[PDB]
Structure formats: C-alpha cells, structure tokens
Amino acid sequence: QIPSLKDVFLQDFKIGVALPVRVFSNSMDVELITKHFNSMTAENEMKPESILRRDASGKIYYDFTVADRYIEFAQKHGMVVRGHTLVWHSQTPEWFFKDEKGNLLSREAMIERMREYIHTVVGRYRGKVYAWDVVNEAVDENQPDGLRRSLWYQVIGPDYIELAFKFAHEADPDALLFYNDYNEFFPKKRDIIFKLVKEMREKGVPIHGIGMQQHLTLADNVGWIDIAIQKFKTISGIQIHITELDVSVYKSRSPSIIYQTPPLEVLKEQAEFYRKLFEIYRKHTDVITNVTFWGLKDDYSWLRFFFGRRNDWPLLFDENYQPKPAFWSVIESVS
Numbered sequence: 001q002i003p004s005l006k007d008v009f010l011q012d013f014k015i016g017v018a019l020p021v022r023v024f025s026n027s028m029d030v031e032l033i034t035k036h037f038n039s040m041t042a043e044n045e046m047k048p049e050s051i052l053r054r055d056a057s058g059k060i061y062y063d064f065t066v067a068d069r070y071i072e073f074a075q076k077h078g079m080v081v082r083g084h085t086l087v088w089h090s091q092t093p094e095w096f097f098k099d100e101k102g103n104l105l106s107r108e109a110m111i112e113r114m115r116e117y118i119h120t121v122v123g124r125y126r127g128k129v130y131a132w133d134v135v136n137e138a139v140d141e142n143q144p145d146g147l148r149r150s151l152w153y154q155v156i157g158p159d160y161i162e163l164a165f166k167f168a169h170e171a172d173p174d175a176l177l178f179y180n181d182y183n184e185f186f187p188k189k190r191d192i193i194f195k196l197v198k199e200m201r202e203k204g205v206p207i208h209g210i211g212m213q214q215h216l217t218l219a220d221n222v223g224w225i226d227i228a229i230q231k232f233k234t235i236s237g238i239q240i241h242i243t244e245l246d247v248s249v250y251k252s253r254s255p256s257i258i259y260q261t262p263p264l265e266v267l268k269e270q271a272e273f274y275r276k277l278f279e280i281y282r283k284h285t286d287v288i289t290n291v292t293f294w295g296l297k298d299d300y301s302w303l304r305f306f307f308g309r310r311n312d313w314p315l316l317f318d319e320n321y322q323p324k325p326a327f328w329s330v331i332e333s334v335s
C-alpha cells in the first residue's frame with residue numbers, strides 16, 4: 001500500500017541496502033528488503049577478515065560459505081550486489097601482511113598475496129557482483145601525499161591502490177570498480193580523492209567510479225555534498241555510487257545529550273535533511289547510478305554501537321519496519 005523505493009527511483013538509480021546475513025532467514029526482513037531494494041551490500045560478510053582463514057600449518061585459505069548466501073539471495077530476488085570491500089586498512093587481519101614468523105612480507109610477496117586474494121574473491125563472483133569497492137578509505141589529508149599510512153602503504157607502497165584496480169579488472173573485466181571513502185565532501189579530502197581518481201584515470205587504471213559513503217549527521221551541509229558531486233563528475237567517464245547513506249539524529253559523533261526515544265522535531269529535521277539530499281541526488285542523476293543505505297531499519301544501524309552504545313534513528317524505516325517521516329520526504333523528492 002506504501003510505494004516501493006526501487007520503483008519510485010527506477011529511472012534514477014538502484015536503491016540498495018547493507019545487510020547482515022541473519023536477515024535472509026527472517027520473513028519480515030525479507031518482505032521489507034524485496035519490496036524496496038534492487039541492490040544489496042554485505043555489511044561485513046565480504047570484508048577480508050570475514051573470508052580470510054589460516055589452517056593449522058599457517059597456510060591461508062578462503063571461507064566463502066557466508067558470502068555465497070548473498071549471491072544466492074540476490075539471484076533468487078533479481079537484485080544486484082555491490083562487493084564490499086577488497087583492500088582496506090580496517091577489518092583485515094594483521095597476519096595477512098606477515099610470514100609464519102610475524103615479519104612483514106616483501107613488497108613482491110605482498111603484491112602476489114594481494115593479486116591472489118583479489119583474483120580468488122572477484123573471480124569467484126565474476127558476472128554475479130556488478131560493482132566492487134576495490135579500495136576503501138585510502139586517503140588521509142594529514143599526510144604529505146594525501147595517502148593513509150596503513151600496512152598496505154608500509155608493505156607495498158603508494159602504488160598498492162592502482163595495483164588493486166589492475167588485479168580486480170583482470171579477475172572480472174565486466175565489473176564496475178569503485179574507490180570508496182567517507183568525509184568525501186569536506187574540501188581538503190574531496191580535492192585529494194578527485195586528484196587520486198583523475199590521475200589514475202589519466203594513466204589508464206581501470207577505475208570506473210567513486211563511492212561516496214555519505215555517513216551524515218544533521219550538522220552536515222548538504223550544499224557541500226552538491227559541490228563535491230559537481231567536482232567528481234568533471235572526471236570523464238566516472239559514475240558515482242552513494243554507498244553507505246545514513247543520517248544520524250545527533251550533530252556530532254560524541255553527543256553529550258543522547259535520546260531514549262527521538263523527539264518528533266528531530267525526526268522532522270531528519271525528513272527535511274533527507275528531502276534536500278535526494279533533491280541533490282536527483283539533480284546529479286546523470287552520474288549517480290546507485291544509492292545504498294547502510295542498514296535496513298533503525299535498530300540494525302552500526303550508529304547504535306560504533307561511536308559508543310546509544311539509540312540512533314538514521315534510516316527510512318523504524319524498529320517496527322514502518323516508514324518514518326524521512327521515508328515520505330524522500331518519496332516526495334520525485335512526486
């Protein structure tokens with residue numbers, strides 16, 4: 001009786017959702033997912049720590065038993081899958097960078113290990129995962145060259161980023177390959193992301209897209225987001241995914257006032273925020289091809305634990321699967 005997000009935005013972009021694997025065995029979760037969403041991302045289940053294993057000998061192997069369930073579900077329900085994520089400083093075991101003695105691998109050995117990892121994971125889902133977050137959160141504006149000094153940088157060096165895209169494109173030449181990041185509309189970081197992607201495109205690196213995480217709060221300036229999309233879309237041939245959208249009801253990551261239940265005025269402010277945001281996304285529909293929310297409904301949000309245990313209401317559906325004020329405001333950005 002309520003409209004379907006994916007149908008409302010059919011001519012604009014895929015409408016996606018980040019999901020933990022438990023939802024596939026929950027009839028009420030499956031009802032809400034299959035009504036509204038034509039794209040899905042594994043919230044954790046396709047990250048390196050979720051796939052990498054070592055046997056009693058210390059030999060690396062791959063466990064796809066959980067990740068496989070996403071492709072099985074997507075195929076059953078006619079959904080596309082964003083693969084998240086191949087190369088990241090987070091949720092990647094420190095032992096992946098080391099030999100049996102706990103010493104750092106050589107650059108040569110770690111390039112080979114990255115190649116095997118990306119070939120194995122992207123190869124397994126070739127033609128079934130239409131888009132990959134190949135590299136996640138590689139930018140640090142505090143560094144002289146703008147690049148985060150992670151183990152990837154320390155063990156391979158600054159070409160690890162372009163190599164990851166090379167290897168992913170080898171494993172699945174039809175996949176759309178994304179560089180994904182947060183705080184992507186803050187000016188200094190925006191300019192580093194722009195320069196990184198533009199320079200990789202100019203030297204023929206197979207990068208097809210920029211993933212804008214859009215982990216927002218009610219304190220964020222939506223004008224800055226419009227300006228960031230305007231800057232990124234000047235890179236010829238690049239498309240944009242909104243990969244991890246949510247809107248915290250708080251105005252910082254460390255609020256001193258925490259809500260038990262959200263004031264109605266806060267939910268209305270959130271509806272106004274989401275409306276202005278979707279007006280900007282529709283304005284840039286020529287470059288945005290997927291808008292994915294980082295969770296199905298408010299009580300599943302990472303924002304209830306990542307910055308400290310607290311209630312937050314960051315999404316379009318409440319704890320009882322009901323549309324929020326923001327659901328209607330988002331729908332009204334079209335209607």
Ligand SMILES: CC(C)S[C@@H]1O[C@H](CO)[C@H](O)[C@H](O)[C@H]1O
Nearest residue numbers: 090137182183213215244294302
């Ligand atoms: C899917 C999310 C966990 S990505 C998220 O972006 C955050 C910024 O708000 C932090 O940078 C976290 O490191 C990162 O995991």
